[PDB]
Amino acid sequence: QENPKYLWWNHRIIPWEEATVHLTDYWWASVTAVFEGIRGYWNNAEGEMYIFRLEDHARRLEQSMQLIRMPKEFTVDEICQATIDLVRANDYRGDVYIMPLAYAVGNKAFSVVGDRTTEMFIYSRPAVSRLEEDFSLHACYSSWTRINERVLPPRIKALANYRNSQLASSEAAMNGYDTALFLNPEGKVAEGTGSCVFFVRKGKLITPDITSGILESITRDTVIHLAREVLGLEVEERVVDRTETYLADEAFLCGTHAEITPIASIDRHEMKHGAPGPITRQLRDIYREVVYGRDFRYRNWLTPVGM
Amino acid sequence: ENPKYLWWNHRIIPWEEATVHLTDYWWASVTAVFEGIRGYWNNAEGEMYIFRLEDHARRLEQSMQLIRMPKEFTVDEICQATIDLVRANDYRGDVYIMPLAYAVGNKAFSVVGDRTTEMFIYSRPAVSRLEEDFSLHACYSSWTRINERVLPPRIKALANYRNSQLASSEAAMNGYDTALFLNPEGKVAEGTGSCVFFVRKGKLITPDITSGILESITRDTVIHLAREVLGLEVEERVVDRTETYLADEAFLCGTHAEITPIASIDRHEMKHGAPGPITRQLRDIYREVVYGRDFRYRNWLTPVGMG
Amino acid sequence: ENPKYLWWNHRIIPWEEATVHLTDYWWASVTAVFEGIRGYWNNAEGEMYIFRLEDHARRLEQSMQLIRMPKEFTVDEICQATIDLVRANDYRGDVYIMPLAYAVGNKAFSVVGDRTTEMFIYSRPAVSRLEEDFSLHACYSSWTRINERVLPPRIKALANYRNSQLASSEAAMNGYDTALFLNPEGKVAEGTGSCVFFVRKGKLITPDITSGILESITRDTVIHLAREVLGLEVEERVVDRTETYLADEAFLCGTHAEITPIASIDRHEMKHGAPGPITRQLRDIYREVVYGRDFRYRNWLTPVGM
Amino acid sequence: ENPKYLWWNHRIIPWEEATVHLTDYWWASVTAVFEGIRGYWNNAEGEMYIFRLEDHARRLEQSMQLIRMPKEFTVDEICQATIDLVRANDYRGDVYIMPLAYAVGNKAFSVVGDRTTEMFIYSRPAVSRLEEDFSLHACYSSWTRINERVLPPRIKALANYRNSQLASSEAAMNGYDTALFLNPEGKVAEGTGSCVFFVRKGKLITPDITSGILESITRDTVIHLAREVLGLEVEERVVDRTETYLADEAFLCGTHAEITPIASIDRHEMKHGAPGPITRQLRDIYREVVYGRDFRYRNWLTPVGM
Amino acid sequence: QENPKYLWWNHRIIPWEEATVHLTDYWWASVTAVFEGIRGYWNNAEGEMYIFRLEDHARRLEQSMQLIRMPKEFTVDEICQATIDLVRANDYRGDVYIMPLAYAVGNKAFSVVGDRTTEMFIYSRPAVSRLEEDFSLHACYSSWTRINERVLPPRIKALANYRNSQLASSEAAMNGYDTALFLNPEGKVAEGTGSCVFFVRKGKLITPDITSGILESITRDTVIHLAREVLGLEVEERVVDRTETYLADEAFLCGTHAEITPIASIDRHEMKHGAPGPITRQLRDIYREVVYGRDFRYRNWLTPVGM
Amino acid sequence: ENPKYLWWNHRIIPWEEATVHLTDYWWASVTAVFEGIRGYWNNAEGEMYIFRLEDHARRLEQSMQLIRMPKEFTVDEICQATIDLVRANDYRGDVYIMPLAYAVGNKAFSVVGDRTTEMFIYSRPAVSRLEEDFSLHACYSSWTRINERVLPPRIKALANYRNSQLASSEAAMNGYDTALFLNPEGKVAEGTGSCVFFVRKGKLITPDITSGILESITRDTVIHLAREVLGLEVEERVVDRTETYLADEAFLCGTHAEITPIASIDRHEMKHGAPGPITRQLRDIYREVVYGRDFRYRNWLTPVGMG
Ligand SMILES: *Cc1c(COP(=O)(O)O)cnc(C)c1O
Ligand SMILES: *Cc1c(COP(=O)(O)O)cnc(C)c1O
Ligand SMILES: *Cc1c(COP(=O)(O)O)cnc(C)c1O
Ligand SMILES: *Cc1c(COP(=O)(O)O)cnc(C)c1O
Ligand SMILES: *Cc1c(COP(=O)(O)O)cnc(C)c1O
Ligand SMILES: *Cc1c(COP(=O)(O)O)cnc(C)c1O
Ligand SMILES: [Cl-]
Ligand SMILES: [Cl-]
Ligand SMILES: [Cl-]
Ligand SMILES: [Cl-]
């Protein structure tokens, strides 16, 4: 009904309905699973889809797989080509969200994987952008602590990490908030439940540094480049404290799926300059012109699909 | 090949009918919780006994509650479904039974919100080693056990096993059979799929539950057996790493692992062997209990009526 | 409006004469320690009973010692001053009595040098809810409880309540009646103004004192009553957050809060209600004790002679 | 004895009329936040200059916001009130000015509900030591500095000083003039009432703000002066305890403390003395600034019109 | 001049002057070194020396050596006999303090030992007892933190541990105190710089439990036995807080060398019942009658030397 | 066999004269601090160069100060003594020189109080491997590095190596050449006898000094060489464990270890080899510097006058 015509699985583009499996097949594998979120952005005027920083996502997926210790099976170039092929084959001409997901198949046990082989699918579906809309969310700080390198490295884009995200997002929802921010075990600001967080204070952009215990977000990376290069902003990656964020002029989440999400308040402290505030607005607009292929300066970040 | 049946969402179904799409359950797996339950086949009686079925069903309900899955399955239904399934499968041998509950809602990891609760029960043959004398060499992992700050170990969640996997994968590449965890404070927690006991000078010593461990039912059984049958002094307390190096004996216990003797820890050999005298007594008593040959603990057994 | 008297620096003084300058006590407040004590009015007897007066006076002495206030007011004086004040005020009803001690020293916050010790006792009408069945919804705070490293919770210092205020303010704006704290290690400590108990499978469980909590006198009372009157097993131990989500019942206790049932924690509902069976028994036993109708514990009571 | 006036809740009031009841402000004190601001009297000019008045008024606004006090007094009002008070007091000498804001709410410590915001400003004579060469011996405290988990040090709250008091009281009884804090992770934070700087090999080093310190305005001033006037490299970073034992020079800075040289830390003597060469230069530059004799930084000064 | 006639070294009693070595011989070995402190107590009336809990000390030394991973070389019985032989040979008839010290000889490097053999000497010298004197010390809590199992297990009686002790004792001395007490990394009471600590409050004896991060003191063990068995005191081994110790009725250090050392104050808070307070006094007296061989109930703790 | 001389307490003495008693220095070793210094023999010039002698002498003085040893030896004396000794020994080859200072006072570990300061300097042949291409396999230890709370890593104290030994002994029994430490917060600190560098995408990354590491002089050298000769971007910062798994190259550096390439970490292979391109450049530049063949860094060298 509302399923794509195809997916990619284990080196092959296949009709959706051929990837039928048993209920009991993938539960143990899910504990090993790592994934990527990738957007294809549809430029109607050009009649072209641009995949955003596809190679960087493919590379991070390879790194995640490596950190899980999955044997080599899929190259970066194969992941990139498979993605292009799948988006083309699906023949949906609109904004999409693409999820490669890799998993090890080994022991029918959760505790220990043993002898394993590596498998992977890529799943592409329509997904709206909101880059043309001005909106914002109310955030709280969670009473649950972010995973850290001691227990579950946040660098690894593992499915299991999201159980931690879920503790926080479920608490935000029952406590009257749209979204939750995490503190790390040391009590410093880490990231959102599915994205990284930026603060604007006195004309400066401030974001937790990578060793704060966060995923090395590609949207985050993009934003830092755009802030420095297009807007000439000072950007500090540093340790960030909870109460300083209460006083931010502006704040936003960023991630592939969430794009640039302005934050109106944090623990009910309202960002002084609104949401999206002036600087967030500029970053959001620049980002949108980049990802839709309307900004020649950042062409190398885009992979045209050819449809 | 495969069992004849599964139980799924209130009904016993033929194995072959439980087909699904490859992409169906990856997000759900982040919410998933499970139980391990053994059925033990007593050939002389021609009967299967399920060990502490109601205790497992209750812990499953607690896990689901702690995930905030809406009510859907009662403890009594879980118990009856399990009995029905083991009988229907008509396999006359040691089995391992896995009830596994999951919430279905958003095809997103970061947040589920208004979702429904689903569950299958999967019973498969699984050998016992209770008649074999064997032992494993353990290391302490360089990875830290999850704690209540980040991922409560009380909840039998699939996601927790990503942490188990860091440690067990390190044990395997470093020449050990099995890994033990320290908690963030540096105290002894549990094994990657089981709890741990130490014997020193006639006394049984095991990390207390607030050490950051699952409230193991085999652990609970062992404490009852040690106190009531053998009159051993049993301490649940904070346990230090180096004291375990000097244990006379040590063992893992868990539903799947049964009673697993440990020969050495970080290459320090338990001086009374593995299984040492006390482990041997406990292993034998446990075996006579679970196979239904010890009337003192019959209340822990659910006969399936395979006759 | 106001009580007829208070007690201040060794003397009962008419309310209106205890006037001071705006700038007198701000620095002093950083050193200040206090107690909460209830007087319970038994109408049938026409008598007021002060609950565990001497124990509170002793804890006040300990707090003052831990602040290093020079000796000035003995336990005996605190007890007598309290009795005298409640009698002089001639209010025949449930009261809440607050002795508050402070060092007078440097007009600086950072440091006091040589200091003298001062104290007032302030008694005011305060209703009991021990005849009412009610309960609160609690959350765990995202703010951490003070610990011995930074601000020993053993000391009943005013400054500690700035930490309480972070949590109770968050509970209020997030839709809850009351907040529970985790300590820095992530274990269950206490409420913002009281200690917490959980009932599970017929057993009473409460964070041990080294969890980083005040040594509550209501807590101590409850442990005695649970063991002695109901024959319950009571465990003082490390308590984990998720185990409390599964408690059959839960309650706060403290002098002001009395026995306050908890209906839910982080929206996990206590399965046996609020007050559940065991809480109800403890609340009722406590009420019969403090109003002087249980002679087994009469030695905890100081009759005022009203 | 006493200033002729203070400012309170929108009005200048004669000193003697600001009388209150003993029991009025104890609960309020737990919510209280304050600022320290100096007025420096330039005798030659016959003028008082208030140092970075607007920055202090803004930090006070921030503290009040972090306590969640409803808006009542704007930055502009705080600045004008300060000017008016110093003028009205007509004291022609170095002063120390303390605005103190507090919420008036529940007569309880644990929790305030709906509250209103109040504030007084209290100006008093206070000597400068910027013309004197002196130094202090410091120890590291065995008590740990508050952190964002429990009591954010960013908030200039009275309650924070209970933590300061643990350390300064220990320094005093153990033979030292002043105490430095480690944060919970064991890194150098700040003094009990000021920030700390170290000089090593011609470089200035100071704990970064996320070390768990107040965002000191004297600290900010010093960083500007070191970089702009002396062309020194200044590093804000994590600082370790033992590296400070090897500093060539060290000093405290804060509004009240001004620039206070440190002779030794845990009896390790700063090798270049106290004030060492660089501290001496910074102290002198700071003095010329605050007394209005350095026109490069005149925008930091508010002339009172005395 | 003032040196014993003999020591024991590597299986042999030797004249003192034969154990000459090069300045550069033992510096790397010292990093590996572990030791024991043992008292011989001279009962003049009997003309006998009694060594206190010699076998327990020998066993702990073997454990320390094991935890350092020194190859087996010296048995418990040899250590005990060597000690007896040496005390006899030295022919000093008075209170002595005996230090066995074991070390690995391997790499001329500190970082890493490599291939190693195990060596050991025993060094016995006159040492006064003060068990007939009433005296006390003023203690402070150190600003330096006690070593823990994460970094340097306090269970192991290693020379290196005392560098940590030295930070605290040096600070006590320069700050006007006799002696320092430690907090562990979690901020809880651990032990003294060379002994364990006990508090008396409301007729009860309270001491940090072993997993507080302390050496498992044999004097501590003795005291707990004596308090329970002779005095019928309630003794709690538990987590202990700093401020509760400020309010103790009494307090004391105990260790082999320090015997029972009363503490008059802690951070200048004076113990309410003096030093030695009533209970400390009773324990000190009972201890003295035991170690000098005047209490038949505890004869098994004593090894008579035969002189 | 042995060098002809040592330096001890202000004088050069014949090796054979520095005899002592077995029992003399065990307590002193707890206070002891040392330096490692290399002399490099340039055969073409027939000269020995001491590398950064004054920097080492200064760090020795700082260590001694931090131990609170009374003043006794000046930096200038240490430097001259070293030169004198290397010359007197008349060995024409690569040497490793160890000045080692210790306080002598009480024959007790727990406390020294009013003691005197002593020092020897010990120069011995030691091969360089700067002309060999080799690499080591590293693991992260399950033991935590000492920190400023317990045992400041800044101080080059013998006692700190007990902590090194836990990790290096674990590496050896677990099949690795060398161990890396995490600090108590779980961040990358240093090797057991050296500092560590990572190369990722052209950038050199090394833990900052407040990570809890010795302020390595080889580390300092490397940062100067990388920036000034090669124009590499060098970050001193907090470093995470899993980021190091993905380093293109990695190496240890220390006086004794020189520049030691790391082939893999926890069996993750550095993808550019060992020595990788950048390590190779740094190793070669370092070699040309220390042997006196690079005039740009001549100021770091002290010629001994062996000619
Ligand atoms: C996916 C994700 C992000 C953002 O990463 P992008 O690469 O920018 O999509 C950030 N944090 C977490 C926890 C995430 O899962
Ligand atoms: C399954 C398991 C146990 C043991 O639990 P039982 O109730 O004895 O099966 C213990 N610890 C962990 C981490 C486990 O996964
Ligand atoms: C006042 C108070 C209690 C209760 O102690 P009681 O002696 O029972 O009144 C408990 N915890 C805290 C934090 C308190 O302030
Ligand atoms: C008042 C104070 C300072 C100094 O801040 P200034 O704005 O420079 O006066 C620094 N630290 C603390 C803890 C303080 O109380
Ligand atoms: C030697 C010692 C003790 C006491 O142990 P005993 O076996 O009673 O001599 C306690 N703590 C430390 C650190 C010690 O070194
Ligand atoms: C000796 C050593 C180093 C390196 O120091 P250099 O000054 O480069 O010799 C680094 N770390 C540790 C732990 C060391 O022992
Ligand atoms: Cl995403
Ligand atoms: Cl299992
Ligand atoms: Cl000893
Ligand atoms: Cl070296």
Domain end, chosen from B106, B128, B150, is at: B128
Token reading at A114: 């043993």
The four Cα atoms B130, B136, B140, B142 give a dihedral, to 10 degrees, of: -110
Q: Which residue's entry shows tokens 């794009």?
A: A259
Distance D164 CA to ligand 4 centre (A): 11
Task: Report the alpha-carbon distance of residue A178 to residue A252 in Å, rounded.
Answer: 13
Residue-level length of chain A: 307
DSSP output for F129-170: -TTS---EEEEEEEEEPP-TTTS-TTS-BGGGHHHHHHHHHH
Q: Give the list of residues 6+ apart from residue A230 with CB closer than 8 angstroms, or none.
A: A286, A297
Residue-level length of chain B: 307
Residues of F in Cβ contact (< 8 Å) with B182: 142
Same domain, E100 and E137: no
Task: Report the alpha-carbon distance of residue A62 to residue F115 in Å, rounded.
Answer: 60
Question: Has residue D298 been placed in a domain?
Answer: no
Instruction: Assign 3-class secondary structure to A63-75.
Output: HHHHHHCCCCCCC
Nearest to B128 by CA among B38, B18, B5, B229: B38
**Closest ligand 4 atom, CA of D218?**
8
DSSP output for B102-168: EEE--S-SS---S-EEEEEEEEEE----TTS---EEEEEEEEEPP-TTTS-TTS-BGGGHHHHHHHH
Task: Report the alpha-carbon distance of residue D123 to residue A252 in Å, rounded.
Answer: 42
Instruction: Give yes or no for a contact between D180 and D138, defined as CB atoms under 8 angstroms apart.
Output: yes
Token reading at D121: 């400003």
> What is the three-class DSSP state of E305?
coil
Domain end, chosen from D109, D128, D147, is at: D128
Q: Residue F261: in which H helix or E strand, if any? A: strand F258-265
Residues of F in Cβ contact (< 8 Å) with A150: 186
Which amino acid, D4? K
Pairing of strands D258-265, D136-140: parallel
- CB atoms closer than 10 angstroms to residue D289: 23
> What is the three-class DSSP state of C148?
coil
Same domain, A50 and A100: yes
Q: How far apart are the first and last CA of chain C?
A: 21
Same domain, A77 and A196: no
Question: Has residue F284 been placed in a domain?
Answer: yes
Task: Report the alpha-carbon distance of residue C243 to residue C205 in Å, rounded.
Answer: 10
Token reading at E305: 């030397």
The verdict on the CB of residue E191 being under 6 Å from ligand 5 is yes
Phi, psi dihedral angles at E223 (to 5 degrees) = -60, -45
> What is the three-class DSSP state of C188?
strand
Nearest to F208 by CA among F226, F195, F191: F195
- CB atoms closer than 10 angstroms to residue C228: 12
Token reading at C163: 């930490």
Smallest CA–CA distance, residue D55 to chain C, in Å, is 21
Residues of D in Cβ contact (< 8 Å) with A206: none
Q: Which chains does B contact via 3+ CB–CB distances below 8 A?
A: A, C, E, F
- Calculate the alpha carbon distances from B190 to A304, B163, B207, E11, F270 in Å: 51, 12, 8, 42, 33
Same domain, A107 and A254: no
Task: Please give the distance of CA E144 from its chain centroid, rounded to a whole number.
Answer: 21
Give me the helix-helix angle, D53-67 and D75-89, nearest 10°: 120
Question: Has residue F301 been placed in a domain?
Answer: no
Which one of A55, A59, A66, A237 would you mutate to disrupt binding with F, by most F Cβ within 10 Å of its Cβ? A66
Same domain, C143 and C283: yes
Check B4, B71, B107, B156 and give the catalytic one: B156
Same domain, F134 and F124: no
Token reading at C174: 């997030």
Smallest CA–CA distance, residue B67 to chain A, in Å, is 8
Task: Report the alpha-carbon distance of residue F126 to residue A241 in Å, rounded.
Answer: 50
- For ligand 2, residues with CB inside 6 Å are B 36, 190, 193-195, 214, 216-219, 254-255
Nearest to B301 by CA among B49, B55, B58, B43: B49
Nearest to B286 by CA among B97, B54, B53, B130: B130
Question: Which residues of C carry a binding-site annotation for pyridoxal 5'-phosphate?
Answer: 59, 161, 216-218, 255
The verdict on the CB of residue C217 being under 6 Å from ligand 3 is yes
Question: Has residue B307 been placed in a domain?
Answer: no
Same domain, C61 and C134: no
Question: Has residue B141 been placed in a domain?
Answer: yes
Pairing of strands C234-237, C203-207: parallel
Nearest to B290 by CA among B203, B231, B222, B197: B222
Where are the strands (E) in chain C, listed by range?
5-8, 11-14, 19-21, 33-34, 37-42, 47-51, 95-104, 116-125, 136-140, 178-182, 188-191, 195-200, 203-207, 234-237, 249-254, 258-265, 268-269, 301-303
Question: Has residue D303 been placed in a domain?
Answer: no
Nearest to C142 by CA among E99, A139, D61, B52: A139
Task: Please give the distance of CA D17 from its chain centroid, rounded to a whole number.
Answer: 29
Domain end, chosen from D98, D128, D158, is at: D128
Nearest C-alpha in C relative to D67 = C166
- CB atoms closer than 10 angstroms to residue C174: 21
Phi, psi dihedral angles at B102 (to 5 degrees) = -155, 150
The four Cα atoms C217, C222, C228, C234 give a dihedral, to 10 degrees, of: -110
Same domain, C136 and C105: no
Name the DSSP letter for residue C157: B
- CB atoms closer than 10 angstroms to residue B151: 25
Token reading at D77: 């009002």
Task: Report the alpha-carbon distance of residue A45 to residue A93 in Å, rounded.
Answer: 12
Nearest to D92 by CA among D37, D128, D53, D41: D41
What per-residue string of b and e applies to D235-247 under the rule 16 or more CB within 10 Å gives b? ebebbbbbbbbbb
Task: Report the alpha-carbon distance of residue F213 to residue B217 in Å, rounded.
Answer: 44
Instruction: Enumerate helices (H) and strands (E) in chain B, giving the number of each.
Output: 7, 18
Residues of D in Cβ contact (< 8 Å) with C31: 162, 165
Ramachandran category for residue E92: left, alpha or beta (phi over 0 → left; psi -120 to 50 → alpha):
beta
Tell me whether residues F29 and E159 touch, CB distance under 8 A. Answer: yes
Same domain, A119 and A145: no
> What is the three-class DSSP state of A1?
coil
Instruction: Give yes or no for a contact between A9 and A82, defined as CB atoms under 8 angstroms apart.
Output: no
- CB atoms closer than 10 angstroms to residue E232: 7
Chains A, B: CB contacts within 8 A come to 172
Task: Report the alpha-carbon distance of residue F74 to residue F201 in Å, rounded.
Answer: 45
Give me the helix-helix angle, B217-228 and B277-290, nearest 10°: 110
Question: Has residue B303 been placed in a domain?
Answer: no
Instruction: Give yes or no for a contact between F191 and F136, defined as CB atoms under 8 angstroms apart.
Output: no
Question: Has residue F233 been placed in a domain?
Answer: yes
Token reading at F254: 């220390």
Instruction: Give yes or no for a contact between A97 and A122, defined as CB atoms under 8 angstroms apart.
Output: no
Q: Residue D170 belongs to a domain with what CATH number?
A: 3.20.10.10
Phi, psi dihedral angles at C229 (to 5 degrees) = -90, -45
DSSP output for B51-91: ESHHHHHHHHHHHHHHHTPPS---HHHHHHHHHHHHHHHT-
Which one of B198, B236, B245, B269 would you mutate to disrupt binding with E, by most E Cβ within 10 Å of its Cβ? B245
Its sign, for the CA torsion D161, D163, D166, D172, is: negative
Q: Give the list of residues 6+ apart from residue B120 with CB closer than 8 angstroms, or none.
A: A23, A24, B6, B7, B8, B9, B18, B99, B100
Same domain, E119 and E149: no
Task: Report the alpha-carbon distance of residue C194 to residue D109 in Å, rounded.
Answer: 12
Instruction: Assign 3-class secondary structure to chain D.
Output: CCCCEEEECCEEEEHHHCEEECCCCHHHHCCCEECCEEEEEECCCCEEEEECHHHHHHHHHHHHHHHCCCCCCCHHHHHHHHHHHHHHHCCCCCEEEEEEEEEECCCCCCCCCCCEEEEEEEEEECCCCCCCCCCEEEEECCCCCCCCCCCCCCCCECCHHHHHHHHHHHHHHCCCCEEEEECCCCCEEEECCCEEEEEECCEEEEECHHHCCCCCHHHHHHHHHHHHCCCCCEEEECCCHHHHHCCCEEEEEECCCEEEEEEEECCEECCCCCCCHHHHHHHHHHHHHHCCCCHHHHHHEEECCC
Same domain, B101 and B138: no
Token reading at B77: 């239904």
Instruction: Give yes or no for a contact between F49 and F301, defined as CB atoms under 8 angstroms apart.
Output: yes
Domain span holding position F274: 129-293
The four Cα atoms C271, C273, C277, C280 give a dihedral, to 10 degrees, of: 150
Task: Report the alpha-carbon distance of residue A154 to residue A185 in Å, rounded.
Answer: 13
Instruction: Give yes or no for a contact between C291 and C93, defined as CB atoms under 8 angstroms apart.
Output: no
Structurally, chain E folds into a number of domains equal to: 2
Same domain, B85 and B68: yes
Nearest to A257 by CA among A223, A295, A219, A300: A219
The verdict on the CB of residue C168 being under 6 Å from ligand 3 is no
The verdict on the CB of residue E219 being under 6 Å from ligand 5 is yes
Nearest to B207 by CA among B189, B182, B226, B223: B189
Task: Report the alpha-carbon distance of residue C245 to residue F55 in Å, rounded.
Answer: 59
Say whether the peptide bond before residue A4 is cis (omega within 30 degrees of 0): no
Nearest C-alpha in D relative to E174 = D267
